[PDB]
Paper text:
E. coli aspartate aminotransferase (AAT) is a pyridoxal phosphate (PLP)-dependent enzyme that catalyses the reversible transamination of l-aspartate with α-ketoglutarate, yielding oxaloacetate and l-glutamate. During its catalytic cycle, AAT undergoes hinge movement to switch between an open conformation, in the ligand-free form, and a closed conformation upon association with substrates or inhibitors. Using our approach, we enrich the less populated but catalytically active closed conformation in order to increase catalytic efficiency (kcat/KM) with the non-native substrate l-phenylalanine, leading to altered substrate selectivity. Steady-state kinetics reveal kcat/KM increases of up to 100-fold towards this aromatic amino acid, resulting in a selectivity switch of up to 1900-fold, and structural analyses by room-temperature X-ray crystallography and multitemperature nuclear magnetic resonance (NMR) spectroscopy confirm that the conformational landscape is remodeled to favor the target state.
To obtain structures in the absence of maleate, we applied a rigorous crystal soaking method to serially dilute and extract the inhibitor from the crystallized enzymes. Overlay of AAT structures (Chain A) in the presence and absence of maleate show transition from open to closed states upon inhibitor binding for WT, VFCS, and AIFS, but not for HEX, VFIT, and VFIY, which already adopt the closed conformation in the absence of bound inhibitor. Superposition of bound and unbound structures for each variant confirmed that closed library mutants VFIT and VFIY remained in the closed conformation in the inhibitor-free form, similar to HEX, while OpenLow variant VFCS and OpenHigh variant AIFS adopted the open conformation, similar to WT. By contrast, the HEX spectrum at 278 K showed a large broad peak centered at around ‒61.6 ppm, with another peak of substantially lower intensity also appearing at a similar shift to that observed in the WT spectrum (‒60.4 ppm). We calculated ΔG at 278 K for HEX to be –1.72 kcal mol–1, a small difference that would be compatible with the interconversion between these two states to be part of the catalytic cycle.
Numbering used by the authors:
A (entry chain B), B (entry chain A): -2 to 396
The structure:
């Protein structure tokens, strides 16, 4: 017969993971990886946090069974997740307006939400920032939802174009979904101020949007509580919203796939009715989530001694990135860059829009073995005191 | 504005997992759970295998990072999976005709296959046995694939209705997917003989079906190699096929979500092209799979010492279930059953298709605290020397 796989077309390279494959195969010893968002320590390693090793040790000696978790995962994991997102004494929690499912990573939480909406509501369009995480469009298209873009970044002044953002979103109709980065906007690193959040929250309720918050970097901007102010302004004003969160990065648990999808509705009867369909969409996907990574997170967040250790480790990560931002800017000037890169100090999180062209990013990789994303996004957390000088010499050589 | 979640219809109760929730709530003492397919030991517990504990200690001591796995997971995990399925010296492997993706459980493997087929092929129809695992239809429907049923079980002789199976698949077109259970058919426990497998393999190639094997219980019928005879009869004749396999049960790693989706095509260049689109379907779902569970399996299968331990543990599990099958039939007679349950001994795996009616199943639960699936499926692996007598007295009471 003809053959079913014979005419399949090869898939294009992932703009992020394809770069990581090239880096791994590169044989040059001085190669530098500033692509995929991984936290490196001063020594260039990607370590397991001490709080995580201690929690895994507890699990190894106390686990007696591997029997399936519920569709929505470990209950304590869900409860602790809502506390982090909304606060200890939140009204959503007391009113029982929120339900949380443990998911395989933030990516898994985005697909679950996308499947949930495409199959149980009349949602048709998702509004995503321009630029944004490249995988956002793929997740929502694969679920059958259209993806529209709204303006965000002023490339001239390296700032948030709040006028163009609101003008773009005026085309978003009621019932549409609008995606917001909770903090540390990927890839620009520019987040709204609290006042700008409150403006979007009020505009969101009067326009009829369904907010969808992507929360992959809580604690990397200013702090655990501070980074959730934007979400908590929306939460104090909307009847419905969705939060897809990730523990991959603030716990360094990338490959264990630890995330959550939290559903908020007007009242407890509606959220439970909606959550039953979300569990059905999970059942038809991976059935139940992996336990190891979420058990680690739950063990840490529920033990005051481990949590204290983890909160300090997260502070050290946040502050090392800030030190590298300063060192990055100073070193560029020291190596002969005549452009002003001071805007990089004002950006939060792991990434920064360097302003380099696709052709310059290509030169960096081929000629100097410095790997950045074609959009000019660089992982500041991949910079160390040892690789800063060769890295900045290469950037100056291509300007 | 009117809420987006108001017109959502509540999802029905899951036929398997909704049962486990009723069991956890039942306050009556002596309740017995013969529902969800978990392996219990002689004492009524769901333990962690010794080999799994050994492997987990090795990972705790030697893991230095939680860096993301590739989209397709741990390479060694895929190689050992192919050896398990096809044999150490298979032509499929030497010709490099197979590619394997690590997935979250067999469920995740099935969903990945469904998404891959729906988006990259002209497949529109999947044929599933009647009866089958209830979640099969949900997974393929989630991708928009039509699911048709073919006849399988002779509920009169308690055997494979091979004549009806052949006739009911007459309308299966070339390019349709036909789903086969590799061994330990769920729920009936009746598998095709080697001669019947070979007959199906010949018919499958003549009609141009795309075979999809669900392999969740390798090693629970007769043995690791013996249980794969049917798959290898198909593999020797077909240019293309798909295998969703699970390690949830033969390793007791249920909640770590350890599975694999294997893709087989005519040649190495074709499978590579097709596999790139499978990875794209994974990227738009959970991005990359969880490491812990698959790392355990790869460690055991690669270490000669641990593998010998695991194989003996799998033999112990298989043999206890077979003794419980014999004891179940003997005790039913002892307790006054006039219906002949000898067919139980001929069935393979954890599950016994008892032939009880939905009314009798509901009566066992509400009246005696014995929990089985409404189809009459009972988990033999949940029977113990301590609960056998009350269980059989309950059944006899409703016959
Ligand atoms: C904005 C954003 N959303 C989602 C994700 C996915 O996170 P995870 O690795 O937990 O799937 C990432 C990074 O991976 C991200 O930067
Ligand atoms: C036939 C069959 N396929 C797939 C599965 C799913 O297994 P997993 O837990 O790996 O998702 C099961 C049981 O759970 C099964 O019986």
């Amino acid at each position: 017969h003809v053959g079913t796989f014979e005419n399949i077309t090869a898939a294009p390279a992932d703009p992020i993971l394809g770069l990581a494959d090239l880096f791994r195969a590169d044989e040059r010893p001085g190669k530098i990886n500033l692509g995929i968002g991984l936290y490196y320590d001063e020594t260039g390693k990607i370590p397991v946090l001490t709080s995580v090793k201690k929690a895994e040790q507890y699990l190894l000696e106390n686990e007696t069974t591997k029997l399936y978790l519920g569709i929505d995962g470990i209950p304590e994991f869900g409860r602790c997740t809502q506390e982090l997102l909304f606060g200890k004494g939140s009204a959503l929690i007391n009113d029982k307006r929120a339900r949380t499912a443990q998911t395989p990573g933030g990516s898994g939480a985005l697909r679950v939400a996308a499947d949930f909406l495409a199959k149980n509501t009349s949602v048709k369009r998702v509004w995503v920032s321009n630029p944004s995480w490249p995988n956002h469009k793929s997740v929502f298209n694969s679920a059958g939802l259209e993806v529209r873009e709204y303006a965000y970044y002023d490339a001239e002044n390296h700032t948030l174009d709040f006028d163009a953002l609101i003008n773009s979103l005026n085309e978003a109709q009621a019932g549409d979904v609008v995606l917001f980065h909770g903090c540390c906007h990927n890839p620009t690193g520019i987040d709204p101020t609290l006042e700008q959040w409150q403006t979007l929250a009020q505009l969101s309720v009067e326009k009829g949007w369904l907010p969808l918050f992507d929360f992959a970097y809580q604690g990397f901007a200013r702090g655990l509580e501070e980074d959730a102010e934007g979400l908590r302004a929306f939460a104090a004003m909307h009847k419905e919203l969705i939060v897809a969160s990730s523990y991959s990065k603030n716990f360094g648990l990338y490959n264990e796939r630890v995330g959550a999808c939290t559903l908020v509705a007007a009242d407890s009867e509606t959220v439970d009715r909606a959550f039953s369909q979300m569990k059905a969409a999970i059942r038809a996907n991976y059935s139940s989530p992996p336990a190891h990574g979420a058990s680690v997170v739950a063990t840490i967040l529920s033990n005051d001694a481990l949590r204290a250790i983890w909160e300090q480790e997260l502070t050290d990560m946040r502050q090392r990135i800030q030190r590298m931002r300063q060192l990055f800017v100073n070193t560029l000037q020291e190596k002969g860059a005549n452009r002003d890169f001071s805007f990089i100090i004002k950006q939060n999180g792991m990434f920064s829009f360097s302003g380099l062209t696709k052709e310059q990013v290509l030169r960096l990789r081929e000629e100097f073995g410095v790997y950045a994303v074609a959009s000019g996004r660089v992982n500041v957390a991949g910079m160390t005191p040892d690789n800063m000088a060769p890295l900045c010499e290469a950037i100056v050589a291509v300007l």
